[PDB]
Amino acid sequence: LKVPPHSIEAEQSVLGGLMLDNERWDDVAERVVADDFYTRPHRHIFTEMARLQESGSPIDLITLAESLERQGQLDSVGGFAYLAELSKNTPSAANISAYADIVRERAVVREMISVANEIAEAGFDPQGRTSEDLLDLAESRVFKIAESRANKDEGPKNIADVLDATVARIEQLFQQPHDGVTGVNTGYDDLNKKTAGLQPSDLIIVAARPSMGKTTFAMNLVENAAMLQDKPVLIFSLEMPSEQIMMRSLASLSRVDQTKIRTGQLDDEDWARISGTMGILLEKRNIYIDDSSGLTPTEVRSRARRIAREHGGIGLIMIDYLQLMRVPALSDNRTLEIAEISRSLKALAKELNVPVVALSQLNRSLEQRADKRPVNSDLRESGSIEQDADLIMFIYRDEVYHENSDLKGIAEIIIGKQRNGPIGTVRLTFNGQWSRFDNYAGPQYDDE
Amino acid sequence: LKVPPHSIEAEQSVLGGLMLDNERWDDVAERVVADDFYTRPHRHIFTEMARLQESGSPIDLITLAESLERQGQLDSVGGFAYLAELSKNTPSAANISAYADIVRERAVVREMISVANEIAEAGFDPQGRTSEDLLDLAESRVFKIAESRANKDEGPKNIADVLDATVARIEQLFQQPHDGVTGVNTGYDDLNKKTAGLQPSDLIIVAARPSMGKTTFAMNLVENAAMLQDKPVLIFSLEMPSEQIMMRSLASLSRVDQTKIRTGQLDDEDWARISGTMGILLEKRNIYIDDSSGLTPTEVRSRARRIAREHGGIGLIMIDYLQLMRVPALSDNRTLEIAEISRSLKALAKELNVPVVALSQLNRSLEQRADKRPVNSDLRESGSIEQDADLIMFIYRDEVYHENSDLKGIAEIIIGKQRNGPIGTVRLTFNGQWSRFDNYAGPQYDDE
Amino acid sequence: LKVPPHSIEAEQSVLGGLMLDNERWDDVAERVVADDFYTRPHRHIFTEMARLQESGSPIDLITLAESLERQGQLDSVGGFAYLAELSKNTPSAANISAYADIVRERAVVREMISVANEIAEAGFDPQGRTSEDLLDLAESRVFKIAESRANKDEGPKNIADVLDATVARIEQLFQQPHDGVTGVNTGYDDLNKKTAGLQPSDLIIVAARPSMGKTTFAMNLVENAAMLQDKPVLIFSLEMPSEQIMMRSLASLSRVDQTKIRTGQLDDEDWARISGTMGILLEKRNIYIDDSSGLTPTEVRSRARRIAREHGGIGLIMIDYLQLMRVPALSDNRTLEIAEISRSLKALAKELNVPVVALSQLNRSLEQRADKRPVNSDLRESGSIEQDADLIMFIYRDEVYHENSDLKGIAEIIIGKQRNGPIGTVRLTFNGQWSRFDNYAGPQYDDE
DNA sequence: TTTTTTTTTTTTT
Ligand SMILES: Nc1ncnc2c1ncn2[C@@H]1O[C@H](COP(=O)(O)OP(=O)(O)O)[C@@H](O)[C@H]1O
Ligand SMILES: Nc1ncnc2c1ncn2[C@@H]1O[C@H](COP(=O)(O)OP(=O)(O)O)[C@@H](O)[C@H]1O
Ligand code: ALF
Ligand code: ALF
Ligand SMILES: [Mg+2]
């Protein structure tokens, strides 16, 4: 008979210390819960202690015994004599933290044993469940265990700890001779004048109108980053297939249009320049592309965690686009769904320390204004995106709106929202034929 | 005693198929390994088969017996008589992939049981390991479990692999289609591109609103399967009488107006088409339909077993529909009744190894959404249905909800869940006059 | 035989505590009387204790024993040995108030039982009284019960009591010679001219668009509170990691540009400023920051109570922001969830007597208007927010919406709700480089 | 466990 491991002496010491000192109750309340006690009468005792403390009543022997007696639970836990014995057996509450740690350890061990027994029972008797069902159930149980055993600190942090961590980060950055561009370098020096590269755990939003090269600019950034860094990056282009964009990926590098790439022409003078550029992409092995239209945030998070654990973190996550992901729970309201999606993306970016660039559509009210320059009040699914994003940029081409204009080729990236950084406008040189965004080497006008 | 789960019959069928058909060995070796067999003599047999295949020796009864006798492993695996019994017990090697998948599933479940036993042992015996150490050990074990089956084909992978696949696809598709079929034909090659044919023992659920032609589409699938196979087809029409179903089938096959057939106002050419369709159906004589209302799953299972025994198996089962079956034991709880019905249908499909398509109904709240394209949550009692079903497809028609829709005559079959293929939308052409679904020959819209 | 409810152990604890500590006698006198004791000897003992305390005699073993011997009640209460037993039975008198509450509850229940017995006796023997007479008698008894058991407030308070409390408050304020910020000082002279400091138990809501510096202004307020008081402050940064918040605080206090700090391009003077700021902050050591996401109000309340207990109260609570908190009980209704969150926050603020500033987001409809200066309706789910809040301040920046605005670097803090003050707009100077808010040192503009 | 009426507040276009 395998009795589950436990420490009843630790339980009695915890209860007696609570009877002697309620001020450490939060120290007991932070570590263990009512169900953490191995013995059900001890669970009832701790529940009644929590009820007395939440009422503001001091926790002693007599009050707890009377509170249990009013509920008919005094005799169920052993009577007044058992509670007096438990109070007597505890000499001091000074080391009650170690006893609570032991109780929490025993509770975690028993929970692990129970989950393992459930997994074994489901394995011996599948009961109609297939391979996928059993694997998903096991992974869900393990995720519950891991999330229960990750919730340890989850509370206030003193200034001294926060100041030490922040100054450690500051000294780490100071010792690094990065020479500017601390984040993942975008490959655009003018962009790095404001953005200083794609900082990790940042929710960068490239929100642009359709047929503005929004996906083109995002993939230009992705390709430039892959040229610069070798950290594994991630792409989720739900809208367009990876087959098309790869040609565009070979269009920026060759600095030409696709045209013959989409068709079946063979022109191997600059086509031969591409045949060999791909090899440069071959040796990198740091881009993971999966269109997978109709994605949920859970699946995206699972894929991201998989790739990060496989190849040591993620260089850059790419999402195309925000208005394509499906959340079954909040499918009723689109704005709530977008809020949940953006929250999940921000949480994943903070978890894996990776910049996330996601594309967003806009509203038609932008073009209805006299000023067709996109601002923070023009985004489709308005509130949630502006609330949750860290960096927000707008692609503005005056040539699209006004064909007779001086900004032909000049793609204005309006930084509309940046918490850590000055908002503004960065001029570029978008090659509309070549589908290649480049830097603006012309006369940079003053932003009024 | 909790005996570990295993499938000895699947192992025997795999070994006999490898003895008879060596060319499917690469099919078998992709799915199972030597250690996947629960029985150690089967592990030795698979190891010797792998050794003979790597050495170029043919894998038959005599060569395997001689090779096992050379290593002294003939007596360890049961002997020449046992090997001959293994060869004899396998009627055909065509379905060896399903047996190998079953053996792989049993190996995965036993590995999960072993890992759970290790976890329980570490819980009962910490052996110096702290909570962090046990947490890391459990996470490492579940990481190995995930690494046992981690996407593989579903995996996006780094730039190199997807790049060499995609540029090869482009350089092949520059002017040449070169379709690879890759699936059992169900009358829709575009559908068979994703579904890869009607997978046996799978629970396929097609869901639509009433008047969306769900029964019409199911009948078209049944007709295509019947014209593309010799195995008999079984239909359950609880919603409609069998004569109306026959009229729908004749109208779909002969491409005549349903109204003219129903009213009898048919010309000589329509009569000739009807006579030809009747001749084809009387040539087949494999269509068997039951229209009894309120049928229990027990009666359906008994009749299906009767038909399979009388005809050496059934190609396809049709049920119309899920919500019309009756369970007297669960008449009080509708959701539990639906769950038990779906479980019984899945068990029957696994037992008789026949695809079963049962129609389903949606909820009204789907019409309350801005997007009326169905999802998994729109099903009535969707919780059990989504888990039990393998291939879930929805029928959507924007032309129904929009009079000025440009997609008139176009129906969207949205695969929402597929365990063995990609999800997504396939467009088809609908003839309401003929009540027929056919391949969409219009421009191929790039789904986002 | 149903015994009337009592707690003899609690009574003995009370008697022994009164023998040991007479200073809590008033605490005993507030809750219980002599007739509240179940046993007549205990009633006599409490009567003798009351007589001794009224006469000024100490309530100990010897004096009480002598008084009971002089009145001849020493033998009736158990004798000197029993009195010494009662004295010995009490280890501590600190929890004597809860024991008195227990005895009070027992007395109330016994009185209820006695009155119910009287009513049943009058029912079985009407004795000429009509149904009206018996109803009047029963209602009179229930009125007597409700009057006797609820004398300790629990209802409408008398005018005179509120008048005395209010005049005590006014005299307290008059005696205080600070003549200034009654509440926690904001660090801004013109703001404190209208707010008189951040008053305790007040709900303050700061509303602005994202990237307007609302969190920056809240951090500046936190810095001012920390520099102007020794009480600890509490910060909830659910939007940003605590490292970024600390970097913002360092940039604001040290007046160094955030770009150089983030990029690490800091000179010797900037490093000296940062080091001095760190020294001052570590001298203070009164900031506690939590950046956990999805926090329920229960966890926030528990942590706030813990910090207040550990540090003798909390000066200020900061929440960033309202819409990032999660309540599982009202996850389906966002508006009800926001209402319950705001209600719980106001309850906590009144409980701990601490100003709580929780940030909020604006709807974009205000940007649809010609005037973009915020109103009360522009907040998200503002219906409960405006009611529950004590102070509401909007942050407006015309320079954001107008490139040629003359108010560059100027922010309008529009007090839109103030229960004890006028509404109106106060101008402040904003340093985007240092991300700091300061008193506006330009010319004063008349508010029309 | 399921859907169904019905009111109410919020946000979106
Ligand atoms: N002669 C016809 N011409 C055009 N449309 C037709 C004709 N006959 C039937 N249809 C359409 O075919 C659809 C089939 O849907 P239906 O069979 O009613 O769904 P269910 O299977 O739930 O009964 C109907 O919506 C109907 O409008
Ligand atoms: N280095 C810098 N130079 C100039 N302005 C900056 C710099 N860094 C940040 N800012 C400004 O500070 C603001 C921060 O606003 P923020 O505190 O995020 O508002 P909220 O907290 O309401 O979202 C941004 O709008 C940005 O324009
Ligand atoms: F009305 Al039907 F299938 F014919 F739902
Ligand atoms: F981006 Al914020 F409060 F910092 F909305
Ligand atoms: Mg039908």
Ligand SMILES: [Mg+2]
């Ligand atoms: Mg902020």
